[PDB]
């Protein structure tokens, strides 16, 4: 049980901070200063929920141009599907809705850079 939460929770965590260094980096190759702009504050927004996922897995007991374009797209997409298979599992209230409200971020995030492609098209 409470091993299947932690595993779910340090998956998140993991996925939380490969988004961190990743879409800073997505964020230094852009000439575009819309899209620079997305790529930060995603960057920013997956640095707080790793603090936030860090806290409640050490409380459980635990130990933690186009070319561009498309692979940091890759990199959210990955995101939300982590984050719809961990919501699928059957946790504790508390942590569904934490879960819950980080995924909200990640699919805003995503429909933004996915609306700035579209005006370029």
Known sequence: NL???LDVLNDLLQTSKDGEAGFHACAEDLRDPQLKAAMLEQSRDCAAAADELERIVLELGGKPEEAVLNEC?????????????????SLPAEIHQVIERQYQGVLRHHDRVRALRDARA
């Open 3 to 5: 091993d299947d939460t």
């Open 73 to 89: 797209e890759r990199g959210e997409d990955v995101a939300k599907h982590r984050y719809q298979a961990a919501l699928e599992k």
